[PDB]
C-alpha cells in the first residue's frame, strides 16, 4: 500500500537558464531572458563548467531518470538553424553520453523559456508564425544529433506561463503587456509548433528511435468556497480550463480550444481550421504534468474566479483523468521552494515532497490513475526567474558566492535518496 509500484520511474530535473551559467561562453547567443535580466532585473550553478559535479549528485540520489533542457541560443546563437556552435553541441552530447554510462534515462526539453534574442528582435518571437518552422528546424536538428540515446522528449515546458507571463503580465521575458491578443496568438503558435514537431518526429524519427514525445503543461488546483455550491464548482472548472484546458484540449482533446474560452475570448482567441484541429490532437505520447510554485505564485499567475487556490495534487490528477480520457501521466515537475537563507536543513521541502508523493500514490492505488513517473524539481539551486536567488528549489545546495560551487545535499536530497531505495515510505 505505502510502497510505489514496481518499475516506477523516479527522476529529477533542471532548466538550462537556471543552472547552466556561461551566458557568453563558447560563442553562445543571448536569450530573451539574458536580455530581460540585464534590462529588468553570478554564473548561477555553473553547470556548464561543473558538469561532472552535477553527475555526481545524480549518482548520489539514485534516480532512474534526469530531465534537463537544451539552450536553443547555445546551439544556434542567431536562432536560425544553419551552423551550430560546436562547443555547445559537445556539451549536450557529453552529458547524454555521461548519462547512458550510468544507465540514467534522459528526458530532454527543447524549450525552457530561453528564446534566442535574435529571433525576438527580428520577428517578434512567438508572435510570428514564421518561428513555428524555425522551431521545427531546431527540433529536427536535435532529434538527429541526440535522438539515438534519447527516448523521452518534451517540446515546450509550461506554455501557459510562456504566453501569460511573457505577454499578459510582463513578469517573464520578453516582458510584453497590455495586448490580450498577443497572449493568445503566442499560445496558438506554441501549440502549432508543438504539433508540427510531434508530426515531424512521428514521421521521420519514431520508426528508428521509438521514443516518447510530449509537452509539459503546468497548472494549479482550485477548490470551491462553499463545498457543495454548484456555482462555485463551475467557477473552479473555468479556472482549470483557463490554465490547463487551454493547451490540453487542442493537444490531448478534440484539437480545439475549450468551448468556454471560445465564447469568452471571441475577438482575441485565434481560430483553428478544421484541418488544423485534426493535426493538433493526438500529439503527445504521455501527459506531462507540472505542479509547482510557478503555477501558484504570484497571484496574477492565474484567474481564480474568486475561489480557493489549492495544492491538492491528487485532485488535479483526477481532473486530468476525467477530462482527458485517463491517460498515462508523468509528473514533469513537482516541488516547492524555500527562502534563500535556508541552506541544508530544508524541513519544509521534505514535508512538501512527502505531502505530494503521498497524494501521487493515492492517485495510483485508490483512483486507478496511470502515473508512471515523478520528476522531483531542481537538482540544484539556481536562478529562479524573476525571483532570481531570493528563493531556492534544489535538492542540492549551491553557494553562489563561492567560486567552487560544490553541490551539498540537503535533508530533502537524503530523503529523496531514501525514498528511491525503498520505492516509497
Amino acid at each position, epitope marked *: 500500500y505505502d510502497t510505489f509500484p*514496481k518499475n516506477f520511474f523516479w527522476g529529477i530535473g533542471t532548466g538550462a537558464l537556471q543552472v547552466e551559467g556561461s551566458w557568453k561562453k563558447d560563442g553562445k547567443g543571448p536569450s530573451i531572458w539574458d536580455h530581460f535580466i540585464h534590462t529588468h532585473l553570478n554564473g548561477s550553478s555553473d553547470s556548464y563548467i561543473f558538469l561532472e559535479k552535477d553527475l555526481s549528485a545524480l549518482d548520489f540520489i539514485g534516480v532512474s531518470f534526469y530531465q534537463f533542457s537544451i539552450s536553443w541560443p547555445r546551439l544556434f546563437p542567431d536562432g536560425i538553424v544553419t551552423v551550430a556552435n560546436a562547443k555547445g553541441l559537445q556539451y549536450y552530447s557529453t552529458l547524454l553520453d555521461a548519462l547512458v554510462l550510468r544507465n540514467i534515462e534522459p528526458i530532454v526539453t527543447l524549450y525552457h523559456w530561453d528564446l534566442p534574442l535574435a529571433l525576438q528582435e527580428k520577428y517578434g518571437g512567438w508572435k510570428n508564425d514564421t518561428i513555428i518552422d524555425i522551431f521545427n528546424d531546431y527540433a529536427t536538428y536535435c532529434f538527429q544529433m541526440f535522438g539515438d540515446r534519447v527516448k523521452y522528449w518534451i517540446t515546450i515546458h509550461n506554455p501557459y506561463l510562456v504566453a501569460w507571463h511573457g505577454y499578459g503580465t510582463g513578469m517573464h521575458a520578453p516582458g510584453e503587456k497590455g495586448n490580450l491578443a498577443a497572449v493568445y496568438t503566442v499560445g496558438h503558435n506554441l501549440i502549432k509548433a508543438h504539433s508540427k514537431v510531434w*508530426h515531424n518526429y512521428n514521421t521521420h524519427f519514431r520508426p528508428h528511435q521509438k521514443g516518447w514525445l510530449s509537452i509539459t503543461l503546468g497548472s494549479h488546483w482550485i477548490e470551491p468556497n462553499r463545498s457543495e455550491n454548484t456555482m462555485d464548482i463551475f467557477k473552479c472548472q473555468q479556472s482549470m480550463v483557463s490554465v490547463l484546458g487551454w493547451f490540453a484540449n487542442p493537444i*490531448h482533446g*478534440d484539437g480545439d480550444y475549450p468551448e468556454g474560452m471560445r465564447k469568452k475570448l471571441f475577438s482575441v482567441l485565434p481560430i483553428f481550421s478544421e484541418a488544423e484541429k485534426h493535426e493538433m490532437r*493526438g500529439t503527445a505520447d504521455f501527459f506531462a504534468f507540472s505542479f509547482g510554485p510557478n503555477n501558484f505564485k504570484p497571484l496574477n499567475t492565474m484567474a481564480k474566479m474568486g475561489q480557493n487556490v489549492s495544492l491538492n495534487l491528487r485532485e488535479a490528477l483526477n481532473w486530468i483523468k476525467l477530462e482527458y*480520457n485517463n491517460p498515462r501521466i508523468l509528473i514533469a515537475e513537482n516541488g516547492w521552494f524555500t527562502d534563500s537563507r535556508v541552506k541544508t536543513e530544508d524541513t519544509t521541502a521534505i514535508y512538501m515532497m512527502k505531502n505530494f508523493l503521498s497524494q501521487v500514490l493515492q492517485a495510483i*492505488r485508490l483512483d486507478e490513475i*496511470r502515473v508512471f513517473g515523478y520528476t522531483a524539481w531542481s537538482l540544484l539551486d539556481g536562478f529562479e526567474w524573476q525571483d532570481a536567488y531570493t528563493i531556492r528549489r534544489g535538492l542540492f545546495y549551491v553557494d553562489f558566492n563561492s567560486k567552487q560551487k560544490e553541490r551539498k545535499p540537503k535533508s530533502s536530497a537524503h530523503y529523496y535518496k531514501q525514498i528511491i531505495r525503498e520505492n516509497g515510505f
Partner: antibody
Amino acid sequence: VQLVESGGGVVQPGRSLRLSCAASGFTFSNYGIHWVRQAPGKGLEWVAVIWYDGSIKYYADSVKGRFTISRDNSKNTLYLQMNSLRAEDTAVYYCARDRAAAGLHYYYGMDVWGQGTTVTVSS
Amino acid sequence: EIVLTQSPGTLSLSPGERATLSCRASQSVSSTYLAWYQQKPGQAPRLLIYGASSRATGIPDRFSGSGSGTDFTLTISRLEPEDFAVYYCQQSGSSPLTFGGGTEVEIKR
C-alpha cells in the same frame, strides 16, 4: 515462449468459475499479462490486465467488480476469477503477454498469445 | 472511454491488390498506443503492428501502419492468399483499453 489457458468449462448462470494461464520460456515477472475474450461469431473484447508485481490491475467496464485478476510470480501463473456469470460471458478466453517489459520503455502491444480456453455459461 | 470504429466491415479484393483499412477513435489518442492484429478462423490473434506504424517480429513489408489523432490506417500493398483474414485495431492510450469491431478482408472473385 508460451502461454496456456486452463480451467475452461461449463457454469450455471450466476455461478462462479476460475481460470488460469501458465507461462514458460521467459521471465514471467518482467511482463504484464492481459485477458482477452471472444464470443462465438464476435470480435475481440478486452477484459483485464495485471502488471509486474501484481499490485496494479485494470478492468473493462462490462466485467468490472465481478472478475478478479491475480498472479503468482513464483508459480509463473496468472488467474482470472469470474463470478455472477451471464450468458453473454460465454466466450473463449485468451491470456496475452504485453510486449512492454519492465525497464524497457517499449510501446505497448500483445505479442504472445495462448490457444484459449472456452467457457460456456448455461444451466 | 475510447470507442474504436472500423470501416469497412468487409473488404473484397483479389490477390495482388492494395487493401486500405481504417480505424476511427471517438476521442484522440497518441499513435504510440495503437496496434493492429490479424486473426484467422480457428487461430489465436497475431500482433501485426504496434505503435501505429511499427511492424511486429516476423511481419512482412507489405503491411504498413499510419495515422494520428483520431484516424489510423492499415495498408497491405500487395494482397497474398495468407493475408485474407480479419483485422482488429486496438488502443492502449486510454483506460479502459479497447478493440475495434474488426474488418474482414475477403477474396473478390
